[PDB]
Design a protein around this ligand. Structure first.
Ligand SMILES: CC(C)(O)[C@]12CN(c3cc(-n4ncc5ccc(-c6ccn[nH]6)cc54)ncn3)[C@H](C1)C2
Length: 258
C-alpha cells in the first residue's frame, strides 16, 4: 500500500521514512521499528497527543515483528534547515517559532509528558510554517494523578542537555525541557551552539558562567533576547525561569515585524 521514498530523520530505535500511498499518492511520515517495552510506551504517548504545535499521529500497524507508526508529514521540513550557520534567522521569525515552541511545551507539560530531546532537528514545520514538536521515542511521564515523578535516566543530546542531568542522580523534568528551549533560541538567533556540553571541563560553558557575553554566540544576540537567555541558561534548576515567567519576559512580549 505504501512506497518508501526518502529518509526524513534518525533515532535510537528504527527509522523515519517519507511514505507515498500506491493508490492516492498521499505522502506521510512512517516510523519503522524492528522487534517491545520502548515502542509500547512511545505508542501510548503518541495516542495522548492533540495540539496544534505537536506532530499529528494517525495510528499504528503491526506486521509480524515490524511496527509502523504513521504521522502527518511536515511539508515545511525542519527548523534546523531554517537556521543559517553562524547567522541564525531574523529575530521576528525566531520570536514566532519560540512562542509556538512554548505553546507546544506547555501542552506536553500540562498532560504530564516531558519530551527530553528538544532540538531543531525535532522541531518541524507545516505548510504555514507552524512549529510542531516531533519524535516521542525519549518522551516519558513525569506527572501522574497530580503527583510528580523525578527523572533518574540520562538522555537527550549533549549541546542541548541541562547541567543537572550530568550531575544529579534525580532531577525535575520541566527545567530540563526549559533549558533545551534556551539552546534552541540561542541557535535561532546566532546560527551556532554555545558549547559541546554544560560541564566545567567545557571552556565555552565556563565563559558563559563568568558572564563573558562579549564572546560568540552571545555578541550576535540583541540585549533583549540575551536578557531572556540569562534567565533560561541558569545552572541551578531551582533558580531557572519557569514557562509562566518566560511568558512575562520583555523580549517574549516585544512587538516585532518581518
Ligand atoms: C523537502 C522535502 C523532501 O519535501 C520534505 C522535508 N520534510 C520533512 C518532514 C519530516 N517529518 N514529517 C513528519 C515527521 C514525523 C517525525 C519525524 C522525525 C524526525 C526525527 N524523528 N522523527 C520527521 C517528520 N521530517 C523532515 N523533513 C517534508 C519532506 C518536506
Amino acid at each position: 500500500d505504501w512506497d518508501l521514498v526518502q529518509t526524513l530523520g534518525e533515532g535510537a530505535y528504527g527509522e523515519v521514512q517519507l511514505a507515498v500511498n500506491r493508490v492516492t499518492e498521499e505522502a506521510v511520515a512512517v516510523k519503522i521499528v524492528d522487534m517491545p517495552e520502548n515502542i509500547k510506551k512511545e505508542i501510548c504517548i503518541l495516542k495522548m497527543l492533540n495540539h496544534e504545535n505537536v506532530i499529528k499521529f494517525y495510528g499504528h500497524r503491526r506486521e509480524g515483528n515490524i511496527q509502523y507508526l504513521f504521522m502527518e508529514l511536515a511539508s515545511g521540513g525542519s527548523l534546523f534547515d531554517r537556521i543559517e550557520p553562524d547567522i541564525g534567522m531574523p529575530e521576528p521569525d525566531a520570536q514566532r517559532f519560540f512562542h509556538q515552541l512554548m505553546a507546544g511545551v506547555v501542552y506536553l507539560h500540562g498532560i504530564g509528558i516531558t519530551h527530553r530531546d528538544i532540538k531543531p532537528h525535532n522541531l518541524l514545520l507545516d505548510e504555514r510554517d507552524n512549529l510542531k514538536i516531533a519524535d516521542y521515542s525519549l518522551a516519558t511521564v513525569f506527572r501522574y494523578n497530580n503527583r510528580e515523578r523525578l527523572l533518574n535516566k540520562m538522555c537527550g543530546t549533549l549541546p542541548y542537555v541541562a547541567p543537572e542531568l550530568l550531575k544529579r542522580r534525580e532531577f525535575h523534568a520541566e527545567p530540563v525541557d526549559v533549558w533545551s528551549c534556551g539552546i534552541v533560541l540561542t541557535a535561532m538567533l546566532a546560527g551556532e551552539l554555545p558549547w559541546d556540553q554544560p560541564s566545567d571541563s567545557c571552556q565555552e560553558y565556563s565563559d558563559w558562567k563568568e558572564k563573558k557575553t562579549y564572546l560568540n554566540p552571545w555578541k550576535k544576540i540583541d540585549s533583549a533576547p540575551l536578557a531572556l537567555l540569562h534567565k533560561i541558561l541558569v545552572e541551578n534548576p531551582s533558580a531557572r525561569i519557569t514557562i509562566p515567567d518566560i511568558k512575562k519576559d520583555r523580549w517574549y512580549n516585544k512587538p516585532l515585524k518581518k
